[PDB]
């Protein structure tokens, strides 16, 4: 017969991962909301927990 | 009666060759394709031949 690429073994190759990414970009941003008080800052800290207030 | 043309022997004449070139231009460049990376390198160099790799 050949040399006969029909009989030599053939190997396999990999290379590293890599990270997808899925896409829906999210923004609607900047908007409502935004813009943090004072006030919800007194509900945010310790002490004095929730729940909320007026 | 007359030198006479008829009588009289006329050569030929050559000039060297020319290069034709056929157009039809082939660019659709640049786009993809383009942008090699290293990993269809990794395929590229040896050693760790083909077939390709996922």
Do not use: H, M, R, W
Not at 1 to 25: C, G, H, M, R, W
Not at 29 to 41: K, R, V
Request: aromatic share 10%.
């Amino acid at each position: 017969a050949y040399t006969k690429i029909s009989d030599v073994i053939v190997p396999e190759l990999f290379n590293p991962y890599v990270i997808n990414t899925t896409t829906q970009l999210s923004a609607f941003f900047q908007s409502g909301i935004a813009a943090t008080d004072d006030e919800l800052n007194a509900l945010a800290k310790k002490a004095g927990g929730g729940s909320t207030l007026n």
